[PDB]
């Protein structure tokens, strides 16, 4: 598991800015519908994370058309084109799984002023 660390480390060349659970991020996703490529957008609140080097992942949550959807992203996959933090949230936990039960004004997250 010392030569595994070098195979994985030569694929870890992206930027991946710093972010934490409770933040509102916007993910740019590569999309195909035939021959023309384009970048779709996913915007939501980060509720989970996984810091395992190349095998890292994070989960964002959004309400699409009255329906909640959660997507898990592989950070170092070429699909995840870019990521930007739109708003910084202030939470005490590391995994915000309790947000799945709350819907409207109950699921607000206090902004991190500094």
């Amino acid at each position: 598991n010392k030569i595994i660390q070098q195979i994985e480390a030569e694929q870890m060349n992206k930027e991946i800015p710093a972010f934490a659970p409770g933040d509102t991020v916007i993910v740019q996703v590569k999309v195909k519908e035939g021959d023309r490529q384009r970048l779709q957008a996913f915007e939501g609140v980060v509720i989970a994370k996984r810091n395992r080097g190349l095998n890292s992942a994070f989960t964002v949550r959004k309400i699409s058309n009255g329906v909640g959807v959660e997507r898990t992203f592989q950070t170092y996959s070429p699909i995840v084109d870019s990521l930007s933090v739109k708003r910084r949230g202030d939470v005490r936990k590391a995994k915000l799984y309790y947000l799945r039960a709350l819907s409207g004004k109950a699921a607000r997250i206090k902004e991190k002023l500094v």
Partner: protein, 122 residues
Amino acid sequence: MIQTQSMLDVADNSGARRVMCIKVLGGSHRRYAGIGDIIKVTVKEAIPRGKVKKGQVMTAVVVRTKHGVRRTDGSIIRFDGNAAVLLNNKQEPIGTRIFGPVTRELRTEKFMKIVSLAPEVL
């Protein structure tokens, strides 16, 4: 994954609020139905002046599940409830408008009609 007696709702304006799976089609001893899989349902709750009545046996396609669908990069997309679209005898949707989002696994030669009508595709 959807099996018999799973209660799933409807993403159309056909008349049903609530259907129930009674058979997973497409194989002997088949156990579950994923997104994009054909099932046979019965209508448990309806709307007074819709075009389907309570107690009707008919076919549907699963478009939204809590178990979710994986992608080639390892990612997964999960919804908060199971939803179906009712179909007539030509595998075509009965309703005319589609609610909520759908996914790109419906972009086959036989379900492009519900991809067009949906407000969003993930």
